[PDB]
C-alpha cells in the first residue's frame, strides 16, 4: 500500500508513492532508468530498476558491487545514492532493486561542443579530476570515462555517473592489450578537454584499430621502449605502421581555437595526451596545474576515502537494501 505500479514500455516500475511523474530516460543491459519527482524531498530524481539482477552469479555480483560502492562512495563530484528500495516485503519474495539518485540536467556530450570560456572549461575539469581522485582513493579506476557518463547541471556542477570497469576516449593502454594504472583516466580527461577547445571529437576512430591510427596520426608514433610493452600479436600490427612525427601542441591547439590561459591549457593538454602512460601526468599533478589549481579547495581535492551462490547473493543484496 506504500507502493504503486507504472507501466514503462514492457517493464513495470513498482515504486514508493513519493515518486511521481515517472518517464523513461534510458536503458541498457543492467537496468532501466526513469526521471521522476520525489514529493517528499521536493526535488527531481533518477530511478534505476536493475535488470535481471539474479539471473546468474555474474549479474548478482555486479548488482551487489554497484549497490555497495554507491553507498560507501560519497563525494560531491560522484553521483550519489539518495535511496534504495525493493517493492517485495520479504527475502523469499525479493526480486527487484531500485536505486534513486539526484536527477542531473545533462551529460557532457553537447555541452563540450558549445563554446565554453576558460573559467567554465577549467572549473568543469577541476570537478572531473576531484571526482576521479576520489574514485582512485576508493580503489576504483574507471578505464572508460567519456562525456556520456559524466553529468552536469545548469548551475555548472558536475558528477561522474558510474564506476566504470564509443571508443574515442579510451586510453592507449586500453585500445591495445596493456596493463593500466591510475593515470589511465587522465587520457580520457585529455580527450575531453581537447574537445572543449576544438569543438569536435579529437580522435574519432571508425573502429578499434582505427582509433589507434587516429591518435598516432596526430600525436606521433610512440618510441621503441613503448613498443616492447605490447603483447606479440598487437605489437606486430602497431610496430609496422608508417612512422608519424606528430604535431606540436601549438599546432594541434593554436590560440585561435580558444575563447596566458591558452598557454596554460596547452601545457596541461600536452601532459595528459601522452600515449606512453609512464610519461603521462597523474591526477594529483593535474589538480596542481596552474590551469586547474585556481579552484583548489582541500575539502574537494583531498577528500577522505568473491564466490557465493545466487541465493547467497540474494541475501547479501537484500541486507544492503534494508
Amino acid at each position: 500500500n506504500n507502493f504503486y505500479s507504472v507501466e514503462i514500455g514492457d517493464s513495470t516500475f513498482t515504486v514508493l508513492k513519493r515518486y511521481q511523474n515517472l518517464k523513461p530516460i534510458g536503458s541498457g543491459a543492467q537496468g532501466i532508468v526513469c526521471a521522476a519527482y520525489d514529493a517528499i524531498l521536493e526535488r527531481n530524481v533518477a530511478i534505476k530498476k536493475l535488470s535481471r539482477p539474479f539471473q546468474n552469479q555474474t549479474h548478482a555480483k555486479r548488482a551487489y558491487r554497484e549497490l555497495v560502492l554507491m553507498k560507501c562512495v560519497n563525494h560531491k563530484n560522484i553521483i550519489g545514492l539518495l535511496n534504495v528500495f525493493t517493492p517485495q516485503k520479504s527475502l523469499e519474495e525479493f526480486q527487484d532493486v531500485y536505486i534513486v539518485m539526484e536527477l542531473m540536467d545533462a551529460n557532457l556530450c553537447q555541452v563540450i561542443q558549445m563554446e565554453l570560456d576558460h573559467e567554465r572549461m577549467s572549473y568543469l575539469l577541476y570537478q572531473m579530476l576531484c571526482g576521479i581522485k576520489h574514485l582512485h582513493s576508493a580503489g576504483i579506476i574507471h578505464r572508460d570515462l567519456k562525456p556520456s557518463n559524466i553529468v552536469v547541471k545548469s548551475d555548472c556542477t558536475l558528477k561522474i555517473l558510474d564506476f566504470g570497469l564509443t571508443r574515442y576516449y579510451r586510453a592507449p593502454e586500453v585500445i591495445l592489450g596493456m596493463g593500466y594504472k591510475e593515470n589511465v583516466d587522465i587520457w580520457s580527461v585529455g580527450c575531453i578537454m581537447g574537445e572543449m577547445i576544438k569543438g569536435g571529437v579529437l580522435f574519432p576512430g571508425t573502429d578499434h584499430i582505427d582509433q589507434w591510427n587516429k591518435v598516432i596520426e596526430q600525436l606521433g608514433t610512440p618510441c621503441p621502449e613503448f613498443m616492447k610493452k605490447l603483447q606479440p600479436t598487437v605489437r606486430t600490427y602497431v610496430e609496422n605502421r608508417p612512422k608519424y612525427a606528430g604535431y606540436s601542441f601549438e599546432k594541434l591547439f593554436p590560440d585561435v581555437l580558444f575563447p596566458l590561459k591558452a598557454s596554460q591549457a596547452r601545457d596541461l593538454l600536452s601532459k595528459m595526451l601522452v600515449i606512453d602512460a609512464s610519461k603521462r601526468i597523474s591526477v594529483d599533478e593535474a589538480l596542481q596545474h596552474p590551469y586547474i589549481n585556481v579552484w583548489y579547495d582541500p575539502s574537494e581535492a583531498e577528500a577522505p576515502p568473491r564466490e557465493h551462490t545466487i541465493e547467497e547473493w540474494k541475501e547479501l543484496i537484500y541486507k544492503e537494501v534494508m
Binding site: 558549445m114 545548469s154 555548472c156
Partner: peptide, 9 residues
C-alpha cells in the same frame, strides 16, 4: 576568482 554558477544546456 569566483566559480561559475551557470551553464547553458
Amino acid at each position: 576568482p569566483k566559480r561559475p554558477t551557470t551553464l547553458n544546456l
